[PDB]
Ligand binder design. Structure first.
Ligand SMILES: *Cc1[nH]c(C)c(CCC(=O)O)c1CC(=O)O
Length: 289
């Protein structure tokens, strides 16, 4: 009887993710209707607090570090590929790219880590969805681009479209990359129970440590900040956390393994802030203004 209203972005990726979640939730056979309402992060959240919509599906790396009171992340499904992906026009791996090669990405996080590995290449802004950026790679003045492996996966691109999957040792992923967030109201106990079966605890634990570090550093998509957690055999969370200068010449990196997501994320931020990472972040945020 109850029709769950799911608010979604207009883009092809967002609607693809939203339909995937709805089809997943339907496998539980519980009596709910689902209906997408095409609707900015503030607009979605206020519409959810206004109860105009009941939930929304976002890429976790696009979630704000701080949710407004009354809203929660109700479900984090099994994580897809977390890695950044290099796609080279002429098929060169990162270490094979010619001197001065132009790599297209508008993410300071991605560009700064690449420049920290090779400062003889250039990072240049690029816009468009996956299909657009891939076509720009064939023409134009880019020697390679960086995309999220999970985005390529969810958009039906073959794994062999990627020239090189970047391991965290070369590029620490954005916090939450490869994960989805289902946002809903904190007191919507009915929806929360429905979302429980889709939640993957191991993914949620790791992402929770990433997000605590992101929150305590006041980070976001515009900040060269990165964090990736995974569950080790025995239950320990391993968190790699990184803050980089835009030019790639300053790298704050912290590796922490432990049991508690909040404790690990908190220590990561504390250790990096004491070295000067927070001062770097504030300078980059100022330079954007
Ligand atoms: C937070 C965020 N969201 C997207 C889609 C991106 C990548 C942008 C790009 O041009 O590569 C980011 C930044 C990030 O750290 O991945």
């Amino acid at each position: 009887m109850r029709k769950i209203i799911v608010g979604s972005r207009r883009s092809k990726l967002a609607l693809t993710q939203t339909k995937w979640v709805i089809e997943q939730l339907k496998k539980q056979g519980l009596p709910f209707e689902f209906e997408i309402k095409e609707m900015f992060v503030k607009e979605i959240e206020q519409a959810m607090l206004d109860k105009e919509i009941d939930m929304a599906v976002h890429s976790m790396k696009n979630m704000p570090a701080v949710l407004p009171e009354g809203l929660t992340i109700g479900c984090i499904p099994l994580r897809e590929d977390h890695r950044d992906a290099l796609i080279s026009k002429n098929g060169e791996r990162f270490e094979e790219l010619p001197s001065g090669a132009v790599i297209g990405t508008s993410s300071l996080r991605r560009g700064a880590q690449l420049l920290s590995m090779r400062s003889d290449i250039e990072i240049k802004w690029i816009r468009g969805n996956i299909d657009t950026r891939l076509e720009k790679l064939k023409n134009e003045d880019y020697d390679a681009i960086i995309l999220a492996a999970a985005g390529l996966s969810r958009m039906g691109w073959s794994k062999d479209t990627v020239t090189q999957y970047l391991e965290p040792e070369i590029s620490v992923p954005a916090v939450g990359q490869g994960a989805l967030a289902i946002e809903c109201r904190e007191n919507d106990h009915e929806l929360l129970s429905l979302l429980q079966a889709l939640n993957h605890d191991e993914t949620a634990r790791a992402v929770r440590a990433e997000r605590v570090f992101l929150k305590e550093m006041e980070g976001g998509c515009q900040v060269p900040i990165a964090g990736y957690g995974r569950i080790l055999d025995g239950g320990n969370i391993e968190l790699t956390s990184l803050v980089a200068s835009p030019d790639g010449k300053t790298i704050y990196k912290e590796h922490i393994t432990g049991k508690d997501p909040i404790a690990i994320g908190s220590e990561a931020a504390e250790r990096l802030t004491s070295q000067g990472a927070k001062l770097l972040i504030d300078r980059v945020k100022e330079e954007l203004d």
